[model samples]
Target chain A: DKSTNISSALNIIEFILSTDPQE
Target chain B: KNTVSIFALGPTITDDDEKMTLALLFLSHSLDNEKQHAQRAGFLVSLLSMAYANPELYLTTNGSNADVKYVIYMIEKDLKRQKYGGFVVKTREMIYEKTTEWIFGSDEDLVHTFGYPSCLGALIIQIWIVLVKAITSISGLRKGFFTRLEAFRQDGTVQAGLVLSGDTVDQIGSIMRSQQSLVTLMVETLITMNTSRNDLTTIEKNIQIVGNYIRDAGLASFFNTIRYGIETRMAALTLSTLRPDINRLKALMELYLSKGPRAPFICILRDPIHGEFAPGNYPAIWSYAMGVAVVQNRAMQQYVTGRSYLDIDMFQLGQAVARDAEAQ
Candidate 1:
């Protein structure tokens, strides 16, 4: 659960940062 | 015939973890019937998942047709018919645990509660955009369905609490009117909020964090490649209409940056148990501020260094802002 939460946090942060503007 | 069968799709989903995953996927797929609804459901799912994982994000325990209970029930009954009783129990437990945390958890536990995609700056903005649209739309289905969110906003102990403040609401309203994508609106909101706070250290830290995350994620080269392609493409197009707005945002960035570190900015106090900001997350504000600063700086740099700078628009500014915001 701990590792998964951390990974989830990173995935979210990455998505927010890298999301295309056209999207 | 386009209707979905939850059992047929995930008959093998029996494990505690996978059951929750399948249930959410089913709900997400069900809500994806319309593009807008799909996005709304996505936002709800993100909150629901966070509520499950952290509990502090949970809004209500009362039985209601419009709250999380209804949404969970809406999904659970379908799973029940599929003989996933265990899944229902686990799901119930998850919701219970989260709500319990919200009501009685310690502050230490709250700060450690990760809100996953909710913590992502872009998602936060997109969710807010969807929310604003729902609140103002002709269809009233979403207004009731999101009662949990409404309650959460009123609770003052969740991260959503701060983002829904009057000033932020006005900011959200302005961004909504700015004719930007929900994502861009969110980015701009964060940048505007953060830069206005005047916290130089946090702003600088967030900027550095952006570079670190890109490098760590191994997307620095990829980002630059995409960025360059877009820049080149925009340089060939007409930017006459966008020049003024771009210049305005750039000027705002410059003005904000010029007022060098004076008073220390203390924006919000994080609840140890609920993980909500007393007022707001200072770091997040800085991150978004840095994002705007970086993008504007980059655009101006390209223009000054002799490149087709037509692509230097507000959306780029927002994207840059979110990148930095998430670094926090």
Candidate 2:
């Protein structure tokens, strides 16, 4: 509920996307 | 057993505005208001919804397997069900229309509505990551994606044409007149063909592909946040253009010459790190660039396991940076 593997995983992916736009 | 039935039925079931479109809209704002529950709430709705459409339309239109159906959560290729793809694609298109309408909003002013949520961001990214992985792990979709990228290499006009035809959503001029950097990034993907007219039809398909990528990435939202930041700063730059050329350049000169405890390079753009740079009198500019730097730092990177910049999670390290900034 508070934190899960799923949320952690997504948070990282978004970090990656925002930092790098294409690849 | 009863899922894509929901997606497939929603599209065809509607002679009206369509169910999925409204559902998608509600989901977007919903994730922002309460980050956790809706995070997962949205994760699955379109997960199954989009997955069904891909095979239905992609397989039917592009391949030999014309009978694809959603049997509960999973999809199937059968010889009997050829008629439903149009509905899936139709609803998919409707959803796309509402997406652009919601996102573009006639020009973003710092993505006030966009969120940095875990469930939703992961849902969108993971879904595409799987589809794209399967794609190479894997074609109307494949050829179309590549075709549009080639068109972008030719010029800005071609690049302009690339993002939205069906993408343009019949509204090319919106993205055309603004957001030079963001459109260029899409064009970057477009030209980088190994990555648009019938290329346009393909463009629509791929356009949606990239457009969806941009949408889900909040990539478009992030870029506009930066662009308007630039929009604000550049105005400052040009305004300063006539006034304080020597004065502002010294501001930058100080950072390179200064020690931070020492300073960082634009290196934040390259990866994640800590307190980097700032400006004077550049409030909007300061916010966007600062957010970009800090957010980039915020990423819990895959490698850092734990930096001078090595903190594996840039987000964790970014927290370090923020707390440190607070310290000084």
Candidate 3:
């Protein structure tokens, strides 16, 4: 989802979801 | 309504900088296919649904890192071009309507939530401001906006009065009078205390000192007092301008609120020059005076209270005030 044609919204979403402390 | 289930795994890259590098590595590459563009347009709706369902998780503020605001806007723009052509030109059409609906429909009163230093302060306020601007430009949005929104028409002076109710005339007036007598008699009180170790609580002998002063100074009525406020019954109930003590002033002030609304003037202070009465509350007058002063001369803004509000974005303070009020 974060790959080519990175929509600004997607980038934001990806960052937020991924930033969670790794289990 | 039918819906499609969609989900994607984010990059395994632990470092945000690394994640950003990869995340930003793509966009507008002639999408190579119509379906991909269409999918891109459709994808945003799904994500927003997820956010709507779990706002605290997705919509919460991460001020420095991934500010979702820019992301939301970009998602919209990218999705616009994602469809590639006129056939699918309508990408975010439902976004405006649905976004407005979800906001007003929420249980939380946004006025409280976006108050300073709320974690999401700037975000929600910006959204609200944009919503207002959008409504101002669009008749449909304007109609829908106010219907859900409730309003209160407040009188500032009345608000002040309601707050001031606890500090009644007799309550303060008596205190002032008590203090006045204390200051005048403290010298003799100290002498009496010096003569004895007993816990004395009786009042006597002080009258002689007062009588001596009254006779010696011929301390008469200060000046000017009392006009018949009520004519019909002439209740002989009175207010005094006789400035005997600070407490006396308190009694006189309380007198203004006398006998219901028939007194010469109610709380609304007159603008003597303008021949207008101020709003029926204290804050209205105070704000009016402050506003006039600030506009009339630049010097007023230089004052401690003035420039602080005048200099900064007043909206932020307004946001803060709203926050505090909703909080309280």
Candidate 4:
């Protein structure tokens, strides 16, 4: 019920494995 | 559905440089073996894998130092065989500005995009071309008839002489406004010091003073008034901006000083007019410079870090820089 029909999504991938200082 | 054409490295493979002999043979397969009736050119992965797995072992065992030099020579020779636009400042600007603009849309919106002075300064140079041309156009040519006394004394009354009509006046104004804002913001971002921003503000004020004088001067000689104004004042401001404030320059200096070791890259500017340096992000320079710096930082991480990205070549990075550099 809290969900709206119109929505945008935020997608993010945290590359914890490879990145040393993670930029 | 593999219609075989050209095979180049991507995300998965990178250690092509280390194994010179095998790498050359593999390249030969792509170029030399094209005529041979071959269905599945299969040695690509094995060669790459062998190179990646043990660069030290492969290079040390093979003793193919000259082969590396030969490949570089051959590549240069091939490039010379073809004709392309030589490096130029405008091209440099196109490249750098696009990269800087790309970073603007990236996660590192404010800082990441223009953190390096070289990166930010290069982008500014791209904009500066338009800025300079705009200045020149507004300011009349020295020898042109319009610039001489004849244009000044039209009829009995000297038609108050000047160049640059109305619209250009505002556009130059906008450029100055935008440039001042950009310079201050960038300097502020670099050092997190308000005074650095203020110093640019002082330059902006000085530019405004000159702009005001040009607008108000009654002399019938000033060609393209806006152009004259900006050309004189903005040039000075441009120089001043490049001369980083002592404190701000120190911030960059400290970063270098803290990181012990003589860096391979000195952040000296490449003139944008020169086309030799690839346009935009210059990932080769950046990555190589950064990689070398990073490697030096941690003496242990030499073979470990950046091993995966060995497959990705400089051209790919250059193109990527161009693609991103040009976008909005």
User: 2 or 3: which has the higher lDDT?
Assistant: 2
In angstroms, give how far residue B324 of model 3 lies from its true place: 44
Candidate 1, superposed: residue stretches over 4 Å from native:
A1-23, B1-20, B23-31, B38-40, B47-52, B55-251, B254-328
- The CAPRI-style docking tier of model 3 reads incorrect
Chain B TM-score (each prediction, in order)? 0.24, 0.21, 0.16, 0.15
* Superposed Cα deviation of residue B276, candidate 4 (Å): 23
Per-residue lDDT value at B88 in model 1: 32
> Against the true structure, whose TM-score is highest?
1
- Candidate that beats the other on TM-score, 2 or 4, i.e. the better one: 2
- What TM-score would every model get versus the actual structure? 0.23, 0.20, 0.14, 0.14
lDDT of 1 by residue, B101-217 (tens): 321231322223633222332223323433333323324324432443454334332355324333333433333333223322223223333443454333233333332221112
Q: How far does residue B245 in candidate 4 sit from its true spot (Å)?
A: 1.1
lDDT score of residue B282 within candidate 4: 26
Clashes of each: 8, 22, 7, 21
Descending-TM-score candidate ranking:
1, 2, 3, 4
Candidate 4, residue B17: the lDDT equals: 31
Candidate 3, B199-314: lDDT as tens digits: 43211222222222222110011111111111111111121211122223223334433422222211111113111122111122123233333443456434326322231332
DockQ score for model 2, please?
0.02
Model 2 CA lDDT for position B214: 31
